[PDB]
Design a protein around this ligand. Structure first.
Ligand SMILES: *[C@@H]1O[C@H](CO)[C@@H](O[C@@H]2O[C@H](CO)[C@@H](O)[C@H](O)[C@H]2NC(C)=O)[C@H](O)[C@H]1NC(C)=O
Ligand SMILES: *[C@@H]1O[C@H](CO)[C@@H](O)[C@H](O)[C@H]1NC(C)=O
Ligand SMILES: *[C@@H]1O[C@H](CO)[C@@H](O)[C@H](O)[C@H]1NC(C)=O
Ligand SMILES: *[C@@H]1O[C@H](CO)[C@@H](O)[C@H](O)[C@H]1NC(C)=O
Ligand SMILES: *[C@@H]1O[C@H](CO)[C@@H](O)[C@H](O)[C@H]1NC(C)=O
Ligand SMILES: *[C@@H]1O[C@H](CO)[C@@H](O)[C@H](O)[C@H]1NC(C)=O
Lengths: 216, 162, 226, 49
């Protein structure tokens, strides 16, 4: 999980159904709910700040090159596909299909809408596929992906020989592995539990809150 | 009277809402509808047998978009989560926005309104609302046989406060 | 150049703190939030809470206990609930502070006390060293980071064939400026001529895709020739 | 959530934006690189190990 639904519950309209007598009673108790309203506004700003801290870590929104000549690998699944109307990659479209009031409860819209967020995850991805870490560390530095792998293998202690001599096999192994990730998300919903549990818990907390209005 | 923000009291129910025709079909005996939160949403008109839906009168938060007082006193107001009919008026998914000028040119976010719209003070100066810019677009000239090696460095000291 | 560039970077730190107060937002937000919390606590003290009058001595003086007990009970419940809200707010904020404190403790140990090879945990760029400075109810870090600056075009290839045997770099990258082949360190352009001391031999040409043809020089050979 | 989100931002920086040799921080096994994918109110990572 990264963020939660931004909701704002107004103290006066919520507690009192647009009654002046009730409002005068509420003001008698002083400054309780004005700090409730400020604290709940604070909750909302943090969620946007969260998505700033997680995604907006890149200064420039890179785009992938047109021709997908990536040393034999097939990253076409995780890269954006133009055919879908929203510029969303295939695996996000797999999640965005797999994953599915008026009593003072307001749902404030998020700062970063789903397409813009997808643009960040495209920028960050195209940065990895064309720069490795360098685009994070400083200005983006172009690097062929075969060498980026050979770098990373030398990082984990396996010299570049194993890469270059066994490139085709890893290409097939990784592509099939992505295929497995496709089928595992497409058919099995157990892995995707945590976001659904966040939605369930929060939307239940609101449903209980609004339900309390009907308690004597 | 329908489609109007009217204080209503039907069979002594009382409340405030917008009376609209409801496609939902009561069973003949039923009289009062209700919600998941157990509040009245559907009523049967007593005198003449028509089914009325209760939609609560429009509402939303009030947020202001204000630049520095010294730079000027001009201000643009955000009516939250209301469509631009109840109220240089610009309609965004956040809500109706009054007193701001839409521009298609994009800049870095300065004052965020939500749903991707950020405001900033620029040209003679005024308040402009624009789709927020994600950063400078920079395609990299990726090739199978091309490498970029830095030939220089800058030691930048950054302050991080906890 | 490093000495003066670092001194200038400290100079810019001087100017940035001396001139711009937006940096200290987080600590100022902590202080303002806490002071505003206490101020709100006192405001709740001086609020009636649905009784005859807010002042305890007033309600005491005007009404005697047999009837007054309900009003006093109302003032107790209101104040105690306000204190509950205030303590729970302070206690949770203390927990978030504790999380930031532990994050600082880790950042102190792993970044100040020693160099950390973790990326962006100590400011953007490769990390060299960080310095602590004390501050009111907080700590301010200076993160000395290395940032690559100017690019240069080179053609490249995964490996080099000399006699049909493929040569891979122990450290660095095979780079050619178009007419000759050099090996350079990964984060800084320091071209060096290809030798057997920087490269280790393995296998044959056919398996590796994209290899180019390039002579590999052997430092030992001119020593045995001479 | 913010504790998880800070954990995620740490992962995205140390795992996507950089290679990390921290064991099991980025999925079981030695770590090579990671991919971010957006999701409603959360992020899903593909850890290549
Ligand atoms: C980089 O890719 C290009 C194609 O976009 C390669 O050009 C062709 O590559 C094939 C396979 O190596 C050869 O059979 C052709 O003769 C090449 N044609 C041209 C126009 O050169 C290029 O060789 C690739 N380079 C590397 C380093 O793999
Ligand atoms: C004027 O004051 C506002 C805040 O009150 C500040 O944001 C702005 O930068 C100030 N302008 C100048 C020129 O000092
Ligand atoms: C806002 O009201 C106008 C007037 O009927 C309508 O045409 C428009 O569709 C409304 N906007 C939305 C989002 O329904
Ligand atoms: C872009 O500018 C043109 C002309 O200046 C205008 O008609 C159009 O509405 C602008 N685009 C947006 C999204 O406002
Ligand atoms: C390197 O070449 C690319 C295109 O091949 C170019 O965009 C880039 O500016 C070049 N670098 C320099 C320092 O000129
Ligand atoms: C290097 O030499 C071998 C042997 O003749 C040849 O088959 C191969 O094509 C050469 N590689 C390149 C990139 O020309």
């Amino acid at each position: 999980p990264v963020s939660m639904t931004k909701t704002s519950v107004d103290c006066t309209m919520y507690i009192c159904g647009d009654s002046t007598e009730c409002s005068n009673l509420l003001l008698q108790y002083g400054s309780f709910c004005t700090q409730l309203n400020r604290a709940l506004t604070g909750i909302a700003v943090e969620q946007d700040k969260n998505t700033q801290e997680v995604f907006a870590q890149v200064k420039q929104i890179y785009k992938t090159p047109p021709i997908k000549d990536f040393g034999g690998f097939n990253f076409s699944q995780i890269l954006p596909d133009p055919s879908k109307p929203s510029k969303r990659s295939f695996i996000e479209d797999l999640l965005f299909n797999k994953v599915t009031k008026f009593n003072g409860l307001t749902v404030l819209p998020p700062l970063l809408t789903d397409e813009m967020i997808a643009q960040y995850t495209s920028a960050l991805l195209a940065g990895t596929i064309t720069s490795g870490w360098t685009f994070g560390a400083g200005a983006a530095l172009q690097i062929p992906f075969a060498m980026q792998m050979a770098y990373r293998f030398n990082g984990i202690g396996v010299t570049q020989n194993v890469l270059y001599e066994n490139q085709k096999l890893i290409a097939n192994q990784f592509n099939s592995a992505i295929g497995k990730i496709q089928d595992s998300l497409s058919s099995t919903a157990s892995a995707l539990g945590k976001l659904q549990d966040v939605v369930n818990q929060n939307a239940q907390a609101l449903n209980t809150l609004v339900k309390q209005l009907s308690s004597n | 009277v329908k489609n109007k923000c009217v204080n209503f009291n039907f069979n002594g129910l009382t409340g405030t809402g917008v009376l609209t025709e409801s496609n939902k079909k009561f069973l003949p005996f039923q009289q009062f509808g209700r919600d998941i939160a157990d509040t009245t949403d559907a009523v049967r008109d007593p005198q003449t047998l028509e089914i009325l839906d209760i939609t609560p009168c429009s509402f939303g938060g009030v947020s202001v978009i204000t630049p520095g007082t010294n730079t000027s006193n001009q201000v643009a107001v955000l009516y939250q989560d209301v469509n631009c009919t109840e109220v240089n008026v610009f309609q965004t998914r956040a809500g109706c926005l009054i007193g701001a000028e839409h521009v298609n040119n994009s800049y870095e976010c300065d004052i965020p309104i939500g749903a991707g719209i950020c405001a900033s003070y620029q040209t003679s100066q005024s308040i402009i609302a624009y789709t927020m810019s994600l950063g400078a677009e920079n395609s990299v000239a990726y090739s199978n046989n091309s490498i970029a090696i830095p030939t220089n460095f800058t030691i930048s000291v950054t302050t991080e406060i906890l | 150049l490093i000495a003066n560039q670092f001194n200038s970077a400290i100079g810019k730190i001087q100017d940035s703190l001396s001139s711009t107060a937006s940096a200290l937002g987080k600590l100022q937000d902590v202080v303002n939030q806490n002071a505003q919390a206490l101020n709100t606590l006192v405001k709740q003290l001086s609020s009636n809470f649905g009784a005859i009058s807010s002042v305890l001595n007033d309600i005491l003086s005007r009404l005697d206990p047999p009837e007054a007990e309900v009003q006093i009970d109302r003032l107790i419940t209101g104040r105690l609930q306000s204190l509950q809200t205030y303590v729970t707010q302070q206690l949770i904020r203390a927990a978030e502070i504790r999380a930031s404190a532990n994050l600082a403790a880790t950042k102190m140990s792993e970044c100040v006390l020693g160099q950390s090879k973790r990326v962006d945990f100590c400011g953007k760029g490769y990390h060299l060293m960080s310095f602590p400075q004390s501050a009111p109810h907080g700590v301010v870090f200076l993160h000395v980071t290395y940032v690559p600056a100017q690019e240069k075009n080179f053609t490249t290839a995964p490996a080099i064939c000399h006699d049909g045997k493929a040569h891979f770099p122990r450290e660095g990258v095979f780079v050619s400026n178009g007419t000759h082949w050099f090996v350079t360190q990964r984060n800084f352009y320091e071209p060096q001529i290809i030798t057997t001391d920087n490269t280790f031999v393995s296998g044959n040409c056919d398996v590796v895709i994209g290899i180019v043809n390039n002579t590999v020089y052997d430092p030992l050979q001119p020593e045995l020739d001479s």
